Symmetry: D2
Subunit: 330 residues, 4 copies
């Protein structure tokens, strides 16, 4: 099995851990964060959003024991001191959001790990990969990025649409759930003022190059998409609203059929499809990174349409982080 | 002064009442709803969203006394029995959402009132009017509609954009606050299933012909706009997200200047403009029916842009309901 | 197996249905409510609070098919016309909140059912039963009540405390989750004004004789307890805060040991016990009707203490509704 | 006028500033925090909870200008470097929560200020004062504490009750609004695990010696009161639930009359009284630090009663912080 180490036990770190427990190809052997093992065990056991951990967890002599397996717990502020090799870590899930450049993420390899997967879009030239879009483009690099949750929702849908009808240009909006970077009440947020305003009280406009980033994993769409977001008072699950002009005329029924076809074929497991009267909570725990909502979209004409797709910003992305780890280890 | 009677003391009814207290041209003399005067006084005095009533309110012998003036309180299930003439009602604000056709709203005139203003889009052929769009088209009709809150936000913005650059086609989304028609927990909503799902827990897709209705008050745009909505966990204030293709190339700076010009000119008081880092609560109590958010919008190119405009779905609309009443009484 | 019919497919009705699927002694064969079978299937399949139904559900010719079994779906406004005997209903779960008196609930027996269980406190003299308190007092009555969710949380705890140390007197408060009877925004609530105020915006004081009702299922405490509640902006799970004066001095450690003993003994399955840093969501789906929070309580002295106990107002109660059905069918 | 400097522009700092604008005896001349003047101006102008600033605010050459007066803006990490004397600061409102001991708060005096008022309970021996309880006990100390919001709500009520009927012992609970120290989603909170759980999703048990602290400002009650709290999903306004055993028998009507008397007499302006069907939002902006809710309380008998009192944890306390400043400057 692939030995994985997790750096950063935040929302993404804890959910990749949970999702990993079902895998048979991967095993989390170590976790690093400024948290004691007993507190780490507590954060794993109880989750406001996803409920109690489905398994056993306990602390035996400064060490965490999940489902019977020992997990090394450390608190190194510098990755280079992690000694991942002592625990035999093959790939490290860099989920701190602090080391998103080659030089910084490199420390993990210097520390004994073979490869690194950033659980966020890279800040430098590090290659990004999105399942359903360009995983096949992996060229053996030892340091990669799984891009962002929104990009993972948008890219798969955009590819289906572009491949079938040709996207001339598109603009998107993501009505996004509240996240850890936000504040409970109006507070300090130096770099993003709107982002400091009370999360549970507001609809908050926010910037995002997730739409632009689609152009990275799908070069054919480079420069044809951009967009923004609105953070709203929900704890989890977001939704993308994509408005596109099509090259080839396509009725709404043809669009639904094309997306349904991909969800049951080439993109099975990544792109989902529904015609039910769903609401956001219906996707809490959703593994697909993009679930097309047939009844929610609306077309003005056969060349100008508004498409809607759901995504559990925590679960979907986390499951694909593991998919990328397994893919670069092949 | 214009004597107005209010039928339906719901959110709209109570807020038009509050906003009317500042007017000098209008006076609310009667209110009709299945609520006792003392309960009516309580709903007026305390408001979770807008705070305590700024004035005096009390019940003196089965009758309500607001700011010193007597208000007739009745509970007629049938408008025809309202005897609006006994209290001298000139115009009636039909805010029950039950009489949105000529025949049904007619009962008010039969009851002694001269004219009727529906606080919602008409269901039949009754003419709709939106301030900043077609108030000048009023042709003395005795029964009119002020259309919907979203249409009041969208129409003014759409006119500025179309007049200046020509809208080829557009699609809009309104991230809308929760309203009285929604449910606190998953409950029965026969005609709109998604709409029955717990409001505070979900992002809820919802239909709306507000975009299409712009084509009514602005015939030049008929058939060029449509859209949908998402109800979210906030108590008040929504926002429109308008994606449009322009006939004439226009940089984002030119778009901002055109909207700012209208907000300070022809559309002063109806269309607002800001370049600040605003969030939804910053518009709780907003009188303008559409406040352009300069920093939130984003353009892909000079002919494909996404525009953002805020609106207090309760306050803005209510203030324009009174504006229409004053306009048809001129 | 015991054939059960459910009248009222509200929150309680749908959750008793879900919980029943795990039982082997009971089978839901019919459901009655003013909802079509396809809408009924939708409400069962998607739940904002408890997630998707763990099983199969579909509509085959005006009839619902859950997990392979056929469920009769009707829409009788009058229970007498239900013909429960045609479907062989043994016991009916009266969950409409409309028939809480013997005469009204009787119609079910007149309709062919053998016994009735009200999923709410009876309004007349009908006997109430709470598991862990007086199920053993059942005297073969054909119509019974399972009392209320709060009473089911309070009674078990009160019994342990009284039996061990003697309750001289107590006052309780339940910080209660929002329910279906509340409003999304300030709306009409004739009989309970505070209750009409926007649920997601307020802490709302509310009356409750749940504390007094403990005196019914536990006559030894009659007249020694009373209390009130506060409805807060959460979708599910409440908590009781019980302040009591004890006859016999008891340290806090002795209190915890006494409650822990009962949770693992006589009250196993009804009364739970924890010493973890739990929060409300940690009990979403909780089957025990009362989970003592050891670390949350606080004693002033050995004879004046404040005890805390959690309860999933939907799940716990629903599971005990089925427990009562199985008990009166023995 | 009294020249005041504010250290810490958090919720308390910004609200004391707003409330100060109405005072004629005090003037804020300087503010210190790690925030630029333009961002400081933004936080002052827009408030999710209390709406837009009622006045003028702008930045003229690195300096803030509020309502026409110049305000010095600095960013010293060490109070000793503040040079309060250069701006002529008489009293400093220490609102960072970092300097709650004499030695640390002393730096302000060393920096040129005459006296210091901690906007939080002192961690050392520094004297605490609560308006309505012991302001008259001020003995000219140069460094004082205004204790906590909850203590300011509880103490005034407790005094009225004790003085009139004699409190043998009491236990209290405060259903408290979410604050800045909490998290938007399950996050790290080393010293208080429950406190790290998603604020908008949970009812969160929390410790508090506010009840015990009443014994400091009212020595006659020392050791007779204690309690705890529950943080809930509301942005502002909390409520205390006080259960007390009385020495002298007192009907509920006698209790209401005693509290009403104090609210209109000795405690006018600090202790409020109502018999209306109020909800939490009805006190957003409330200046009294304790508003007795007559209809919400409930008595078991004439010697065991549960009393309820509201408080805007932001506004009330802030107004009394200024009251203490004015009192120690007399």
């Amino acid at each position: 099995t692939i030995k994985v180490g997790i750096n950063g036990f935040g929302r993404i770190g804890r959910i990749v851990f949970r999702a990993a427990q079902k895998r048979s190809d991967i095993e989390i052997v170590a976790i690093n964060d400024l948290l004691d093992a007993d507190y780490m065990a507590y954060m794993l056991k109880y989750d406001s959003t996803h409920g109690r951990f489905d398994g056993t967890v306990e602390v035996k002599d400064g060490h965490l024991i999940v489902n019977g397996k020992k997990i090394r717990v450390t608190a190194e502020r510098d990755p280079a001191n992690l000694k991942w090799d002592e625990v035999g870590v093959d790939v490290v899930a860099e989920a701190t959001g602090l080391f998103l450049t080659d030089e910084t993420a490199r420390k993990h390899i210097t520390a004994g790990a073979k490869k690194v997967v950033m659980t966020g879009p890279s800040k430098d030239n590090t290659p990004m990969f999105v399942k359903g879009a360009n995983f096949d483009k992996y060229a053996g690099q030892d340091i990669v990025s799984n891009a962002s949750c929104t990009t993972n929702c948008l890219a798969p849908l955009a590819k289906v649409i572009n491949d079938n009808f040709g996207i001339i240009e598109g603009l998107m909006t993501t009505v996004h759930a509240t996240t850890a970077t936000q504040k409970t009440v109006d507070g300090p947020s130096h770099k993003d003022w709107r982002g400091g305003r009370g999360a549970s009280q507001n609809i908050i406009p926010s910037s995002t190059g997730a739409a632009k980033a689609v152009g990275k994993v799908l070069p054919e769409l480079n420069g044809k998409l951009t967009g923004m977001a609105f953070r709203v008072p929900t704890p989890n699950v977001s939704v993308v609203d994509l408005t596109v002009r099509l090259e080839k005329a396509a009725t709404y029924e043809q669009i639904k059929a094309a997306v349904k076809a991909a969800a049951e074929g080439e993109m099975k497991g990544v792109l989902g499809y529904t015609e039910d009267d769903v609401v956001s909570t219906d996707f809490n725990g959703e593994v697909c990174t993009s679930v097309f909502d047939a009844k929610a979209g609306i077309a003005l004409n056969d060349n100008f349409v508004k498409l809607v797709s759901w995504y559990d910003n925590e679960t979907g992305y986390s499951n694909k982080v593991l998919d990328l780890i397994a893919h670069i280890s092949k």
